[PDB]
Structures are given as C-alpha cells and as structure tokens.
Amino acid sequence: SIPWNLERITPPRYRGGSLVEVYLLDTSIQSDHREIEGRVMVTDFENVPEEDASKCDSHGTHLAGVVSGRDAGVAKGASMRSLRVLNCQGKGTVSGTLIGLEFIRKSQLVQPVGPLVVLLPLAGGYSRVLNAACQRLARAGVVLVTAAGNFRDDACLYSPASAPEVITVGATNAQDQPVTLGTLGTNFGRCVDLFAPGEDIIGASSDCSTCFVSQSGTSQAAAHVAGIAAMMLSAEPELTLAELRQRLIHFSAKDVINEAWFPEDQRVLTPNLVAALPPSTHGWQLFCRTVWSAHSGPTRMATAIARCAPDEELLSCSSFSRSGKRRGERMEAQGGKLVCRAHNAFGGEGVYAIARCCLLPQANCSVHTAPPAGTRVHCHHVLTGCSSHWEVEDLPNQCVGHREASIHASCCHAPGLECKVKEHGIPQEQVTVACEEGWTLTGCSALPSHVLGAYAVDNTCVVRSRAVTAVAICCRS
Amino acid sequence: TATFHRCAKDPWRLPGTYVVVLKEETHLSQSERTARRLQAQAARRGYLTKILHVFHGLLPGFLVKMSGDLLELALKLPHVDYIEEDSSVFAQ
C-alpha cells in the first residue's frame, strides 16, 4: 500500500518539518484539496505571462502533495506557502521568478520564522541573473531545491538547475534508473547534486478534492528532496547549507544507478546517489564530498578551480582530462582559504579540478610543497591528500611524485582523526580501491601507465589510464 | 564594463523586456534614480519605456519594458553591472 517512492526513501532502519516552512513557486494550487487543506497557505503573490482550471492548478497541487500531503507526502506535517509564477500552460518568466524569490526574502525580513526551504520546480535556459538571485538567497541562509530539468541534457545548461549553492535534483524510476522517455528524461551531469524518485509518483490531483494522480518529472524528484530537507532541518535546525548537503549525500543510496544510461562523458561527472531519509541510528563523524569544477576549456594556460563551502576544509585535490593532456593540480590559497586548481596542457582540450571538501571543525590544515627533485614531501599532523603539478609538456604521511613534477601534501592537525593509506595496482582502463566501512575517503591519487586522472567516488578512489596503482587516504574519528 | 546577456535557447527568449542588474552595493534610492534616468534619456530619443519593477533585497536593479535599441545607452548608466533579456521558465 505504501507508494513505491515513499518506501524507496525509507532507510534500512527507521522509527515532520513543522519548525520549517517550505515555499513553493509554481502554478496556482487547489489549496482545499484534502491532501493539503490547512497545510498550504496561498500567498496570492502572482507574476505570470499571458497564456499563448483543473489544468491550471494540476502541477502545483501535485507537488504540494508530494512535499506535505497527509497520505502520500514526504514531510506529512510540513507548512507550505505558495507563490504563483507559472500560468495555466505551466509557463513563467525569469523576471517573475526573480520577483517571487525577492518576495520570499522580504516576507522573511518582515516576519522571521525558522529554517526556510524553497522549492523551484521549474527550469529555463542558463540565466546569469536567475543564478545570481538564487546564490544571494542561499547566502542569506535560505535553502533552495530545484529540478534538474527534463531534457535528457546537461543540467549546467539550465537555470536554476546550474545555480551555485542550490540543491539540484534529478529523477530516478522504480528500478533506481535515471528516467528516460524517448529523447526526453532526467537531466544529468555535474550540476546535479543527487537523484530522487520522479516517475510514477502518486499525489494530490486537482481534478477533484479527494482525487490522486501519478505524475513524473524532475520537480517530483525535487519535491522528495525538499521534504527530506524539511525533516532534516526540523531535527537539526542549526544545519548550514554545507552540513545539510553533506547529510543528503551521506544518507543517499549509493551506486544503485547504472551509469550506462548517461552519455559517456557525463558518467564521471554525475553523482550516483538516490535520496533517502536519515535512519534512526542517527556522535561526530567525518563527512566528505567530491566537488567537480567546470571544465577549464582548451586555452594553453587554462585552469579549473573547485572550491569548498566556507565551513568546509579542502582535504585533497585531484584532476581529470579525457585526453590525458594534463599538467596536474595544486592547492592554492584564495581569500585565506584553500581551493583546488588544475592545469591544462598545451594542446589539451581542457581539464577538471576535483576537490574533496569535508566537515572538519578544529582542523588546522596546511600544504607542504616540494618543487621538482623521484620527488617527495611529507607532513613533518595527518596526511589527508597528495597532489602534483608539472610545467613540462611530458614526462608514511608522505606524498611521492614524478621527478619533474612539484608535489603537494595536505597536512591537517586534527586530533581524534585516524588515517590510513590503502593501495591497489593492476596491469587497464580503470583501477579502483575503496576505504573500509566506517572510514571516509579524504584523498585519491595514482602512484607515478599514462593516467587520465583520479577522483573519489563516494569512498572509492578511481584512477583512469590509457602497472597503475590507485592510492586512497582514508580517515575516521 | 557592463555586459549584455540573453537566452541561448532562442525560442525561449522574450525580447522587449530587460532586467537591468546594478552593482552589488547599489542602494534602492540609486536604483530608482537610475531607472528614471533611463526613462528620461530614452524619452529624449523618442522611445517609450515602462519600469515594471524595482528590485531590492537580493539584487539591486529594475525590470524595464523597452526596445532593445536602447541597450547600448542602458549599459552606460551609472551602477550597471549587466543587463539580461527576459526569458521563459517552465514547469518541470
């Protein structure tokens, strides 16, 4: 009897949202539907373009029901407030959306409440101004959740999906696979934070005050994550955005997506995560996440930069290019904070910088560098990461690099942190080595036959080449 | 130093309406004066304009209904960071 999607987000051990308010920006809604009656406040904010009734409020009503619906909702308690920015054809404007977001911020300033979650179940093309408004609203301390988009395309080409600091959600089906419908389907790529159920999702139907309908889309997926976030923020109201994102990643089902569904180049970039509620089992734990930069592009001196959130520490830095035409990476300070920078090679199509960003309070972390010597440097403190860059066209708390490369060790004073190094090598397109259960991968690199790059996938270090050895640095409390 | 942007997805563009985004620290009073200034300068050139909204609280700036002909002029106004042509968003 439990809808498949609500079972899917139920953790393997289990036992809301009322302190939290969820704002919805959408079509008009049927606020008297019995799923949501008394739970949604209609603001009567409206900013919509001219067209060009059951249908007028179908989309919004269903999503309000996914978030908070008494029978089929994720966060059955939760209070919602709705703004109308989509017309009867489901069409809105970037300007109308901006005015809506501004309205939410003004409401908050005038009558402050607790944590706010804003669900943006909509998409247009990449918009500088829409992304900036989302970022500013996120920085003001509001949580934003958006749909990845339904075009079976790179979510970085769409807004608010592409917007920095917003939680962007793709859709998976009952078989935990990315939704595809012909040439259409869930968007993907490095701007997607995670996936959630978004096919055949039962919820309130505005056809009649007690009716239900199954709908599909990345908004339905985004609505699951908005609900999960509302519950998480009710339990732990002081979470920063970075703490909330790390929990969402951490409590997700991992490696359940067949990445064959995605276009080849997007496989490495797309997180293999399906959202789930936190378990009843939960003491401090080390949370880390992998942050891919935008591609540097092909300029000879191009650099890609991957950054962590202000309250996170960069524990390691790796890089990847598909050609293997690469000058590696280094950790450099910037506004008094370490970032991961990767360098393109001459004639390279470009590279990605890949940060490992972790929640480590009381950490004092530094970088120890040695210029080309093979070349070696150690934390003379625990080693959490090795990086190496070179300026040439081609070739024990210790990092070792190529004799012609500079080598960089990330060293942290973090008492109460235990770390170990696990190695694995083989004859090979890809070699792989995973940390043990209960340990957190902090760093991933290849021993110095021609490697494309290295990157952490959850707690597994992956090395890609054209006698390769993957090296994982793993830590725990 | 002010730049112009419009939607790469051509069918989703909505020409004739522009979001004028001012520099981060711009004050509401400055946004209002800048909007009035655009309208006056436009009017001297024979153009009708309409200020649909003045933004403050997240981004400073304004929404203006005008011909794109005026964009070179608008990009030279004080406080302008960039201008974006309005475009469509859709239920997902």
Partner: peptide, 8 residues
C-alpha cells in the same frame, strides 16, 4: 507523464 509537465 502529463503535458502539464514540460515538455512531456
């Protein structure tokens, strides 16, 4: 999929 969901 319903057509209220663009562009399904």
């Amino acid at each position: 999929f319903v057509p209220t969901t663009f562009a399904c």
